[PDB]
Amino acid sequence: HIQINPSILSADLARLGDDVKAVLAAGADNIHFDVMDNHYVPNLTFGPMVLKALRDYGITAGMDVHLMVKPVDALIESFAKAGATSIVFHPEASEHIDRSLQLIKSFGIQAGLALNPATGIDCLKYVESNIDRVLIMSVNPGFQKFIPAMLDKAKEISKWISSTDRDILLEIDGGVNPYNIAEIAVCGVNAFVAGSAIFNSDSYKQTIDKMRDELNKV
Amino acid sequence: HIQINPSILSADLARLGDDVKAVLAAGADNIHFDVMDNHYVPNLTFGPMVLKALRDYGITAGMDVHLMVKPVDALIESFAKAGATSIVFHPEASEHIDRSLQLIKSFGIQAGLALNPATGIDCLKYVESNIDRVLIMSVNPGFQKFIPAMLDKAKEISKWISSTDRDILLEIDGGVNPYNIAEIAVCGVNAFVAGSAIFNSDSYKQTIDKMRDELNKV
Amino acid sequence: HIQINPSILSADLARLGDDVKAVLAAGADNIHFDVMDNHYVPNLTFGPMVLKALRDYGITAGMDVHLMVKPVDALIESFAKAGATSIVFHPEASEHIDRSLQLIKSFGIQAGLALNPATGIDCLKYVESNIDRVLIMSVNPGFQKFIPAMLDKAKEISKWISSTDRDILLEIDGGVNPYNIAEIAVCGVNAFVAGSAIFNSDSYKQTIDKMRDELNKV
Amino acid sequence: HIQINPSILSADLARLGDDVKAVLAAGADNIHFDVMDNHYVPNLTFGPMVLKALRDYGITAGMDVHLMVKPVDALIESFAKAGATSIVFHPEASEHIDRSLQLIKSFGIQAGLALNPATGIDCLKYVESNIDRVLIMSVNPGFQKFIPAMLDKAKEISKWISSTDRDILLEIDGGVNPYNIAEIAVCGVNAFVAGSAIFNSDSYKQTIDKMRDELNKV
Amino acid sequence: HIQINPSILSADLARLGDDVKAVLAAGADNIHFDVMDNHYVPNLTFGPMVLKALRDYGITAGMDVHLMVKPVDALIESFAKAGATSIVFHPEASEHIDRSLQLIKSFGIQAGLALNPATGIDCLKYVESNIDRVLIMSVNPGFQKFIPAMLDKAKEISKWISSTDRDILLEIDGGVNPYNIAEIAVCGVNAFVAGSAIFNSDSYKQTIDKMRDELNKV
Amino acid sequence: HIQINPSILSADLARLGDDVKAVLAAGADNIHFDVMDNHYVPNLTFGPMVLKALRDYGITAGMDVHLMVKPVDALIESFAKAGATSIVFHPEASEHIDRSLQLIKSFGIQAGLALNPATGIDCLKYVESNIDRVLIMSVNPGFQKFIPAMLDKAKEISKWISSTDRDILLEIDGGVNPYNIAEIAVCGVNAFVAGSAIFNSDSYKQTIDKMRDELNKV
Amino acid sequence: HIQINPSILSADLARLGDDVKAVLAAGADNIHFDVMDNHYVPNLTFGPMVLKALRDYGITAGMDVHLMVKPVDALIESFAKAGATSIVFHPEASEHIDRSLQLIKSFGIQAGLALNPATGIDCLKYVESNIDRVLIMSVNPGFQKFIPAMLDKAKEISKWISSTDRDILLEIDGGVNPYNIAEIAVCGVNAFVAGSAIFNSDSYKQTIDKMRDELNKV
Amino acid sequence: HIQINPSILSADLARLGDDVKAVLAAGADNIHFDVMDNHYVPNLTFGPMVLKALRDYGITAGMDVHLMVKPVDALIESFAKAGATSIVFHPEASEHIDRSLQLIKSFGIQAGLALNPATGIDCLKYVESNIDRVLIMSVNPGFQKFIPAMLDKAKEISKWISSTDRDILLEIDGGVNPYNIAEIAVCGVNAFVAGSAIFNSDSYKQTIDKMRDELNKV
Amino acid sequence: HIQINPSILSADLARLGDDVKAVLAAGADNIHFDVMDNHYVPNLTFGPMVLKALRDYGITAGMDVHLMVKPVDALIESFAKAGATSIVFHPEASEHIDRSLQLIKSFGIQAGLALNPATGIDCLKYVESNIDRVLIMSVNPGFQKFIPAMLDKAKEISKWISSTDRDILLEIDGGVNPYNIAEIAVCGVNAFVAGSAIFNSDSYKQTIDKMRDELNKV
Ligand SMILES: [Cl-]
Ligand SMILES: [Cl-]
Ligand SMILES: [Cl-]
Ligand SMILES: [Cl-]
Ligand SMILES: [Cl-]
Ligand SMILES: [Cl-]
Ligand SMILES: [Cl-]
Ligand SMILES: [Cl-]
Ligand SMILES: [Cl-]
Ligand SMILES: [Cl-]
Ligand SMILES: [Cl-]
Ligand SMILES: [Cl-]
Ligand SMILES: [Cl-]
Ligand SMILES: [Cl-]
Ligand SMILES: [Cl-]
Ligand SMILES: [Cl-]
Ligand SMILES: [Cl-]
Ligand SMILES: [Cl-]
Helix, strand or coil: CCEEEEEHHHCCHHHHHHHHHHHHHCCCCCEEEEEEECCCCCCECCCHHHHHHHHHHCCCCCEEEEEECCCCHHHHHHHHHHCCCEEEECHHHCCCHHHHHHHHHHCCCEEEEEECCCCCCHHHCCCHHHCCEEEEECCCCCCCCCCCCHHHHHHHHHHHHHHHCCCCEEEEECCCCCCCHHHHHCCCCCEEEECHHHHCCCCHHHHHHHHHHHHHCC | CCEEEEEHHHCCHHHHHHHHHHHHHCCCCCEEEEEEECCCCCCECCCHHHHHHHHHHCCCCCEEEEEECCCCHHHHHHHHHHCCCEEEECHHHCCCHHHHHHHHHHCCCEEEEEECCCCCCHHHCCCHHHCCEEEEECCCCCCCCCCCCHHHHHHHHHHHHHHHCCCCEEEEECCCCCCCHHHHHCCCCCEEEECHHHHCCCCHHHHHHHHHHHHHCC | CCEEEEEHHHCCHHHHHHHHHHHHHCCCCCEEEEEEECCCCCCECCCHHHHHHHHHHCCCCCEEEEEECCCCHHHHHHHHHHCCCEEEECHHHCCCHHHHHHHHHHCCCEEEEEECCCCCCHHHCCCHHHCCEEEEECCCCCCCCCCCCHHHHHHHHHHHHHHHCCCCEEEEECCCCCCCHHHHHCCCCCEEEECHHHHCCCCHHHHHHHHHHHHHCC | CCEEEEEHHHCCHHHHHHHHHHHHHCCCCCEEEEEEECCCCCCECCCHHHHHHHHHHCCCCCEEEEEECCCCHHHHHHHHHHCCCEEEECHHHCCCHHHHHHHHHHCCCEEEEEECCCCCCHHHCCCHHHCCEEEEECCCCCCCCCCCCHHHHHHHHHHHHHHHCCCCEEEEECCCCCCCHHHHHCCCCCEEEECHHHHCCCCHHHHHHHHHHHHHCC | CCEEEEEHHHCCHHHHHHHHHHHHHCCCCCEEEEEEECCCCCCECCCHHHHHHHHHHCCCCCEEEEEECCCCHHHHHHHHHHCCCEEEECHHHCCCHHHHHHHHHHCCCEEEEEECCCCCCHHHCCCHHHCCEEEEECCCCCCCCCCCCHHHHHHHHHHHHHHHCCCCEEEEECCCCCCCHHHHHCCCCCEEEECHHHHCCCCHHHHHHHHHHHHHCC | CCEEEEEHHHCCHHHHHHHHHHHHHCCCCCEEEEEEECCCCCCECCCHHHHHHHHHHCCCCCEEEEEECCCCHHHHHHHHHHCCCEEEECHHHCCCHHHHHHHHHHCCCEEEEEECCCCCCHHHCCCHHHCCEEEEECCCCCCCCCCCCHHHHHHHHHHHHHHHCCCCEEEEECCCCCCCHHHHHCCCCCEEEECHHHHCCCCHHHHHHHHHHHHHCC | CCEEEEEHHHCCHHHHHHHHHHHHHCCCCCEEEEEEECCCCCCECCCHHHHHHHHHHCCCCCEEEEEECCCCHHHHHHHHHHCCCEEEECHHHCCCHHHHHHHHHHCCCEEEEEECCCCCCHHHCCCHHHCCEEEEECCCCCCCCCCCCHHHHHHHHHHHHHHHCCCCEEEEECCCCCCCHHHHHCCCCCEEEECHHHHCCCCHHHHHHHHHHHHHCC | CCEEEEEHHHCCHHHHHHHHHHHHHCCCCCEEEEEEECCCCCCECCCHHHHHHHHHHCCCCCEEEEEECCCCHHHHHHHHHHCCCEEEECHHHCCCHHHHHHHHHHCCCEEEEEECCCCCCHHHCCCHHHCCEEEEECCCCCCCCCCCCHHHHHHHHHHHHHHHCCCCEEEEECCCCCCCHHHHHCCCCCEEEECHHHHCCCCHHHHHHHHHHHHHCC | CCEEEEEHHHCCHHHHHHHHHHHHHCCCCCEEEEEEECCCCCCECCCHHHHHHHHHHCCCCCEEEEEECCCCHHHHHHHHHHCCCEEEECHHHCCCHHHHHHHHHHCCCEEEEEECCCCCCHHHCCCHHHCCEEEEECCCCCCCCCCCCHHHHHHHHHHHHHHHCCCCEEEEECCCCCCCHHHHHCCCCCEEEECHHHHCCCCHHHHHHHHHHHHHCC
């Protein structure tokens, strides 16, 4: 089952619980958090207390955290404790990648790595046993249009995933919309983060249905 | 230079010369004719007299003919005489593919083959010397959304083209729009037929500029 | 689970409901319809009203339709509406293979292609997403002994199926009997159409049991 | 032993027995019949009664029939009964290629397939056991100069033939003459159909001797 | 045409305009700036105002900037605005390699990456579309003799460049002189940065001519 | 553009200037000199003074020299000084192949190697940088019919040429005529030396036009 | 000869000379220093003065330094001057890997790289000439049980080492004990760092003998 | 789920039911019987009556039999009748390997082969359909320390298992303990027989938990 | 240990013993003799009596003879008897290469082959057992600058040498100097002949030391 995981960075941050509840009622799968610390990428978004606030509001859906921060261990711990169901970080952001993946897994949740557009897949080779998911960035994080060179990367990561025999989710984030989602999905991507395409549309339900329709034909 | 070739089937057929002149003034390269005979595909569009009419109106731009007809030789001759600058037909539509390509070339114009979504590239192997262009159909002809399985076909045809050392244009037709054009272009496609995306838009200029912008980044 | 799908063309057409009910009670899985239009193959068998008649009689088992007809779209629609659970047709019989597969799938049922003995597997490449099953003909349709050259074809199709990671049923039809079924099954075939071997035998139960016994040892 | 098989289409049709007897006395091996029905190719040549007439005249040499007709089964039967020693037809011309090859073989004679210039060799794969010969067309049938792209096809068919371990004759037809015959023979061709080069020459003997001389040096 | 691009770090910094004008009159192609910020490498050289000063002096030749700085975006902008015609930076020096390449290209100039001796070519894979040139460092930046292990790297980068079909300049910098330049050029290098070998020689003209002579024989 | 280079050995040696002027006016590209010293091959043809005589007569077309002599350096120098535009020699004829190629190039003209029928292409490997052209002999020099085994050699040399990325002319000499020229051209040959086929024909213009016609279809 | 190199971090730091002398008398080969600066890894261990102190105490055995520090050059110099016989550092810890390896070698001692569990072997490719040894970390540095994924890494590094024809020591550090040492050794590892397994055991001699016994059977 | 199958040969044979019940209550999966006949290996252990005795005692857990006997058929029958859930034997111990595997399967239980350290995997090739499990011996049967050369064998058998698409358990027996179990598991082993490591430990629960902990991290 | 073997052709031939003694005292390894007979190459140098004269003078260093003569056997014998320690000759210079190598070896000294720039390595294949060394000529013998195309040849010969498992010295001669020696050495060359670079320098010691310094870093 292909996941549609709306990115809350594009939601109504003044009525976040309400907007999240609505997007989930409209067919979304998990809620996605693009966490930025103004150092690894040039913006600052939201901390673990926002995730905790959504748990207290009653959101029970999965909460996927993408850490665009450096270093990463303190935030792995606080987001895990706040209620994250998965956490991914960038290999370049940790001086001990394997230890950071193990730390995530010590909380009984999904761990993985996020890759900037220029970043290859060699970082996955030796930490395979601690990879539950991979996140492909298809825009320059914290700065757009989907970067088409990422289709081949998704194909290469799919191949690697198949060679492991493990269930590893392949997700993408950056410029995803109903018009390019099928083209990305044929490359092996099973999870899609969308912000603007969903939260800025007149009807979350209709947008998510259009996406599902394209995906069902891949 | 990547070509943007508007398909006149989507234009104002009651003011065709005017609409064609406008799309060319807005940045289009060549005018594309999707010719259907109600037999090879289930609709009927326009004959060689429409192309001749545009020549008499003063259109000097290239006129690319895609024959979705069967058989094909009589129409190759009439479209060539009317002023076509290129003609492509489907291999399944001729009982003498090589002879039909030679016939097109006897008029001093570009020849090639158009491939339905299910059709592979083996048909190109032995007629290589008479292939100036290949047209990939990315929708079911005469019946939609771009068929994502066609990205890999475009990659395979690009590879074949590279192996020949000849200049062979790789074109695509079916559901092309500003949101998926870059994803198709990274697969080796150099020419894009667009109908609805251009002719049904408020500004031909702005639509064509958006397309050029995405293409310039591939 | 390997399927044994009796072909009703060999059944008692004067007491069809009764014969079908009996073969299903004896261990058969699905009922197979070899539909011929006297044009694609040189005989005429039965139309969609026969399938509907079996539904009205109370047969709830799967009903697999093999269209040995040309063209195919009108019959896809009528067999689907009559209650077919799967439909396959020959690639050579449609001028728009992908569209015909999509049409079958629009009815919420299984789609696929049937291949004559001389026909290779290149036709499966670009329509993969719309293939739920493949039918190998092991006799010359509408005209016998199993054609042994089909074992290697079954092996090649099995390999292709494995490379897709999708669940695609591999079925065979033509001269299947208890003495050659194990030899066909070791080549990757999971579904067997048998007519004469079952319907002309003294005991459907014993014949089907003999088949199951050979299959259980592959 | 390389065969030189004159095509009677170029002979004196008003004194056919006499011209055939002369070409055989001059060193020809078999008599070749290019049969056209005005449908598969755009001309009409001769029926089975012409072959029978040559048998009644006393010609005992092999009579090779190339069917450029569609459909093909009725003519396979009549040419076989008239006294043909081999029959080849085009795969595209039969809806049941394997059955048509079997039909030819049921008469105790050689069977095979003829390939138009654009046609590849995939059609030979699954009918191998019923292929005694392959005919490469090196001109557009029923419409010339030898098409040089056919040299590589002959090389590929030779390779396929070697991989089978069976004795399969590789023949070519179209624009063969004493000046290009050696170049075709080095590609694995063992039988040559020549019409004009032989029948329009001043001396059949000298022309056939020149051909033999070039062939003996390959 | 092979480029000889003198590095101004070796020029007379007290009479820079004069020395640059002289080296260009002697046959040099472009002027090369090795920019160091005392952080990425252990020295400090010159800022964008030196490049601007040369533009104001009347130098119209290409000005190639090699940024041995970290981070890189602010300097990309200032060197571009000062009049640079190309800018390269080290992948390790940016946390957003693709974004930094795009930034360079937003100024309408050439972009690329510079590689330290230990750095491999995997960084080029996913940013290919934004690479106009690659700079191989053949000495330890900011610290010599040409490092011979770089010949194989140049061969590997040449191969990669050929596989892209794009025109990508392959340049080298570090210990280049008339005695080793031909050996580097046979490995696929098309542009040579030389400092000491040119600026410390008695005659710029004779040194550049000697270099051209060796290069013309590769 | 494919070259047709008539060999003057077949021209009217008593009215050479006149015959050369006529063949060039009829469409020939360059004039070819097959120089023999009675030692490397068993005949003696013409020295550098004949080439000089043609320059003095006013022939400005390219003059290609094929040295079938041993040793070769003195004749390289005299033919170059007489006005040759290219010189090729046989590797077996020089004890210093690289030096001999360099000598040719020292005159600012094209250099290359000529290969006897038995000679392979290993001689080209290490002198690549000094090879502007390769001449395939398709008859036994100084002694005929085109040797068909040379088609595969031309294919292998074409492949080697493609692997170098350099522009290297591939020429052939020996038994070339209008009937076999297309078959040779499909193997990658771009230049054709013809003697008898042109100079012994009734009309140089018509012969050269026939050749061009066959070549235009490859 | 396989090395057993006890890590002093596990020794009695209050009676270090005595404990080192004892472990060497018990069969140890070299003394291993895991140097941490609280920045590259989250602990602080010991500086060059501890190594010097052991030299002054009379320890003449080899002293291998593993720098888990960033940056690394100042410590390379001080550890070398204190009496180190080998120094390895992490590629990620230096902005000039080749220069840092050269610096180590300038002291006439062994140089190499240490790899964290997630780190691949691409860093070794271009600095090969300056690599005398490689250290595989089999635990997360400065934070355990041997990480089994490191066996395959050791196999890949062994293969690389064999391809160089140079003598490069392959060492491992992290969770090594008598029960897993043979399993690591069959993967090509020739040197073993052990801390706890040796220094916390009742008899250094018996522990080292047990290790030798397992190693002798690989 | 990875299996931990204690070998009863190391249990308290005077209180076997009690010791087995305890090890199962402590987390063990199946009970393993290493059956020796003093001929195939140099010791004698226990017959089918011991297994029956455990069934009568109330042990309902799986009972895996490893026959280190020769010949094997009589014992296959008696162990099956006594209540074995799987039986493996050595290929060298039967003169009819396929028949012996079929015999095991005739009892409706799992069959497979056990391999001595020197024995390769070719024996599995043709009996694949009757292989439910493979047992790797990692010590010399009936005579120790784990033989490290068996890691590569486990990798090769895992690869073979993957190529079959069947669910085949890969088990190992000989010198397995908590310190080497993770290293064996990364090679594809899913079932572990342990005797001494479990039955001679102070707490079965703690030992089995330690094993599970290492396995959970692979 | 890399050899530096000065070529006496560049020494003071009027004070040869003195110049040789000096170059050896300055760090040279062996003395190299480039012997030319005015036939194989266009100069005449020195005969075996010069080598004997150096032996009588007291030179005990190795004396390597490179025969650029044709034929070669008489000179092999006289140079061997005069005191040569190795002799190499060109394959093209002997009609019995294997016999000539055996002749050299019959004197108990090293034998090998010298290769002109154009000459490939196929000549080494079948005489491998009699090859102790290979000499690559990097200039045109007896006529310069190092020919850069020879780097790849050295790489190919190194590979061949590695495949033999024998100790075969790889030497180079022609245009070697301190500025290109490291670049040649990274390609697998272990011995360097230098004439001018050493004998025309102010200090043999300093030149040889500079060479050693570059070589020590490869
Ligand atoms: Cl941290
Ligand atoms: Cl780490
Ligand atoms: Cl037609
Ligand atoms: Cl045709
Ligand atoms: Cl239809
Ligand atoms: Cl279609
Ligand atoms: Cl028919
Ligand atoms: Cl059929
Ligand atoms: Cl920045
Ligand atoms: Cl980025
Ligand atoms: Cl000479
Ligand atoms: Cl030479
Ligand atoms: Cl530092
Ligand atoms: Cl560096
Ligand atoms: Cl038995
Ligand atoms: Cl057996
Ligand atoms: Cl001799
Ligand atoms: Cl010999």
